[PDB]
Design a protein around this motif. Sequence first.
Motif, short mmCIF file in Angstrom:
data_model
loop_
_atom_site.label_atom_id
_atom_site.label_comp_id
_atom_site.label_asym_id
_atom_site.label_seq_id
_atom_site.Cartn_x
_atom_site.Cartn_y
_atom_site.Cartn_z
N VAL A 4 0.88 -1.18 0.00
CA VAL A 4 0.00 0.00 0.00
C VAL A 4 0.91 1.22 0.00
O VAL A 4 1.93 1.21 0.72
CB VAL A 4 -0.97 -0.01 1.19
N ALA A 5 0.51 2.22 -0.76
CA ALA A 5 1.21 3.52 -0.87
C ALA A 5 0.17 4.63 -0.85
O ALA A 5 -1.03 4.34 -1.10
CB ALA A 5 2.01 3.57 -2.15
N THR A 6 0.61 5.83 -0.50
CA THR A 6 -0.24 7.03 -0.53
C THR A 6 0.16 7.84 -1.76
O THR A 6 1.36 7.86 -2.13
CB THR A 6 -0.20 7.81 0.77
N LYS A 7 -0.80 8.56 -2.30
CA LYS A 7 -0.53 9.67 -3.24
C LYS A 7 -1.17 10.93 -2.63
O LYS A 7 -2.39 10.94 -2.47
CB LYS A 7 -1.09 9.34 -4.62
N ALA A 8 -0.37 11.96 -2.35
CA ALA A 8 -0.89 13.26 -1.84
C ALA A 8 -1.72 13.92 -2.95
O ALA A 8 -1.39 13.80 -4.16
CB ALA A 8 0.23 14.15 -1.38
N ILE A 9 -2.76 14.63 -2.56
CA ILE A 9 -3.47 15.54 -3.48
C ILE A 9 -3.48 16.92 -2.85
O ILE A 9 -3.18 17.04 -1.65
CB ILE A 9 -4.86 15.01 -3.80
N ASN A 10 -3.79 17.93 -3.63
CA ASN A 10 -3.73 19.32 -3.15
C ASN A 10 -4.66 19.45 -1.93
O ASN A 10 -5.72 18.84 -1.94
CB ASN A 10 -4.17 20.34 -4.19
N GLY A 11 -4.23 20.27 -0.98
CA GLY A 11 -5.05 20.60 0.21
C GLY A 11 -5.24 22.08 0.37
O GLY A 11 -4.97 22.86 -0.54
N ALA B 161 -15.75 19.96 5.86
CA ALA B 161 -16.65 19.85 4.68
C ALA B 161 -16.47 21.03 3.72
O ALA B 161 -17.17 21.05 2.74
CB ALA B 161 -18.08 19.71 5.15
N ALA B 162 -15.53 21.96 3.96
CA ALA B 162 -15.21 23.06 3.03
C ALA B 162 -15.00 22.50 1.63
O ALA B 162 -15.35 23.16 0.67
CB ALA B 162 -13.95 23.76 3.48
N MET B 163 -14.37 21.33 1.54
CA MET B 163 -14.01 20.78 0.22
C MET B 163 -15.26 20.22 -0.45
O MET B 163 -15.13 19.83 -1.60
CB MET B 163 -12.90 19.71 0.32
N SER B 164 -16.44 20.26 0.19
CA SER B 164 -17.73 19.94 -0.48
C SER B 164 -18.32 21.15 -1.17
O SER B 164 -19.35 20.96 -1.83
CB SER B 164 -18.76 19.36 0.48
N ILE B 165 -17.77 22.36 -0.98
CA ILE B 165 -18.22 23.59 -1.69
C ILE B 165 -17.52 23.54 -3.04
O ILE B 165 -16.28 23.54 -3.07
CB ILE B 165 -17.95 24.90 -0.92
N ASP B 166 -18.30 23.42 -4.12
CA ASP B 166 -17.78 23.10 -5.47
C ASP B 166 -16.68 24.08 -5.86
O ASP B 166 -15.62 23.63 -6.31
CB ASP B 166 -18.95 23.07 -6.46
N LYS B 167 -16.90 25.38 -5.69
CA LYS B 167 -15.95 26.41 -6.15
C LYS B 167 -14.65 26.36 -5.35
O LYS B 167 -13.58 26.70 -5.93
CB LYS B 167 -16.62 27.79 -6.10
N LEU B 168 -14.71 25.97 -4.06
CA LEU B 168 -13.48 25.86 -3.22
C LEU B 168 -12.72 24.60 -3.66
O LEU B 168 -11.51 24.69 -3.89
CB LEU B 168 -13.82 25.78 -1.72
N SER B 169 -13.42 23.47 -3.77
CA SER B 169 -12.84 22.21 -4.29
C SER B 169 -12.15 22.49 -5.64
O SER B 169 -11.00 21.99 -5.85
CB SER B 169 -13.91 21.18 -4.45
N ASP B 170 -12.79 23.25 -6.53
CA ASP B 170 -12.28 23.48 -7.91
C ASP B 170 -10.95 24.24 -7.84
O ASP B 170 -9.98 23.82 -8.51
CB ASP B 170 -13.29 24.22 -8.80
N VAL B 171 -10.86 25.29 -7.05
CA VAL B 171 -9.65 26.13 -7.09
C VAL B 171 -8.54 25.30 -6.42
O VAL B 171 -7.39 25.44 -6.84
CB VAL B 171 -9.85 27.52 -6.47
N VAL B 172 -8.83 24.46 -5.43
CA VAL B 172 -7.77 23.64 -4.78
C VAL B 172 -7.18 22.61 -5.77
O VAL B 172 -5.96 22.52 -5.90
CB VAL B 172 -8.30 22.99 -3.49
N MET B 173 -8.04 21.87 -6.45
CA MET B 173 -7.63 20.72 -7.31
C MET B 173 -6.98 21.22 -8.61
O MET B 173 -6.14 20.48 -9.17
CB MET B 173 -8.84 19.83 -7.61
N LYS B 174 -7.32 22.42 -9.06
CA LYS B 174 -6.70 23.02 -10.29
C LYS B 174 -5.33 23.67 -9.98
O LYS B 174 -4.56 23.92 -10.91
CB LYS B 174 -7.64 24.05 -10.92
N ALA B 175 -5.00 23.98 -8.72
CA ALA B 175 -3.77 24.71 -8.39
C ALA B 175 -2.56 23.91 -8.86
O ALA B 175 -2.48 22.68 -8.57
CB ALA B 175 -3.65 24.99 -6.92
N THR B 176 -1.60 24.58 -9.52
CA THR B 176 -0.33 23.95 -9.96
C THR B 176 0.82 24.49 -9.12
O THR B 176 1.97 24.04 -9.33
CB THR B 176 -0.16 24.19 -11.48
#
Lengths: 237, 300
Positions: free
Chosen positions: A38-45, A135-150
């Motif tokens: 088992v391994a982890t992969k980090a995602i944006n926070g 549950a902040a990451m359940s707000i679509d626009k907040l989730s979107d800007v986090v996951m798109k960040a490079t």
Amino acid sequence: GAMNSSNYAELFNNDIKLFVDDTNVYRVTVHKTFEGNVATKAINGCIFTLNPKTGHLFLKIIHTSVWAGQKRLSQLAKWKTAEEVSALVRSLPKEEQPKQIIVTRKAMLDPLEVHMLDFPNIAIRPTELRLPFSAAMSIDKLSDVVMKATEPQMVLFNIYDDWLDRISSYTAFSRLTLLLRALKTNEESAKMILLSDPTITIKSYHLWPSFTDEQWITIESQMRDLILTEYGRKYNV
Amino acid sequence: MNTVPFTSAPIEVTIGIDQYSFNVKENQPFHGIKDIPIGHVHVIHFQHADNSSMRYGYWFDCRMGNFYIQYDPKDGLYKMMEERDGAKFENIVHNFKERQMMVSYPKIDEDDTWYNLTEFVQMDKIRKIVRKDENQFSYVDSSMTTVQENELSDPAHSLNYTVINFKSREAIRPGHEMEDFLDKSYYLNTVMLQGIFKNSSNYFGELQFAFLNAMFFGNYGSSLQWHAMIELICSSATVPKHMLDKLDEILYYQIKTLPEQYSDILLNERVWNICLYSSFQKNSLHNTEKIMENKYPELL
Ligand SMILES: O=C(NCCc1cccs1)c1ccncc1
């Protein structure tokens, strides 16, 4: 000392204060490797830093690059949170600096106290309140800007939209906590309740739909029922 | 070979001399303590039979002067005094010795306990912690507060231990917050050892002095100081091997000497559990871990 039910009006007084929630800073998907390990992969926070009086949300996006080559990431995440909150306070003019910072988790107290030793007049406090800021990451626009960040990025939102034009901070915070509790308990159900009527939209510069006063009462009712519906489905009551 | 004569013992008192003690009755023909080993600091301590709040005493070194005890009926305590007339003092001690009115410092020849507890303790360092520069001996009692206790009253009657505070700008370098908080090596090695104490001998001297004040006087601030100085070492990843080996010997003798019946009030459960079982040095204190496990397994 500790923020509780007994001292709740204090959130809405004229002493500047911020809530800091670190739940979403270090986020992973757990997966099987080719060899069946088992391994982890980090995602944006993100750090969730909120003025409960104004609705001002300082969302610091935590890009996966900050974890590269680091050890003990759940421990580092608390110190990186305290570093970025400290950096934010130092960036604000003196008259905008908070008098108190309330952490949603007691593990954030020592990291934030140590980073804020320079600010002896800023009180670092825990809370007895079980706040659903995860549950902040359940707000679509907040989730979107986090996951798109490079790259590392601070994004500013008003989590209350224009509600303070019509209701007090006390009422706005109560609405926010009820919406987030519902999104935390059953995200699909909460989202259906918020978005099922296409005639009520989300303004480009808002997070939540443009409900009339009457429509907020209906929405608020549906959320309290969902939380009891799910509490029944959960406990078989 | 050195002697601390007493003018008299007008009030019933338990007298301590280092790790030893004996009971004296109101107006008992008692004129002091003889055969006190030269080469070590000593502490003579008192607890009145009618009032156990009166717990107090004097750190001295017989090489520094001729000292005696005399009861003050105004201040209600046994006071240490210096006799500047060498001949008079020698004459008095000779009379009391001839008439056998003195107790003998009861050292067992095999017995290194007091050396082991005081190895790094110097009378000149004690006098910087306890400020009363017109005397060559230092008064300590159960109620004396530390400079640290007085920042969280009277400055003249305080214990000036080195302030150790893990959440202070002194302990934490800007930009090294997590590193310095989780690994105290910077604070131990650069700030305290190189910066303030100059060497591990002065650091150990203060640590040993704090323990002894905690044990002999039930001085709460001293007990806090002793634990902070242990925790600062145990919480440092980088400590010279010779300092760890010496600290193990220092703590071993302190735990061996501690009365079983005071273990509950003199030992901090959190610090000892962290030091022996969670810290960087959890495997470095073999002697101390063995005596603590065999003597105080309930604390752990
Ligand atoms: O018993 C004596 N030595 C006092 C030492 C002590 C002080 C208090 C308890 S034993 C004594 C009695 C008669 N002649 C000379 C000396």
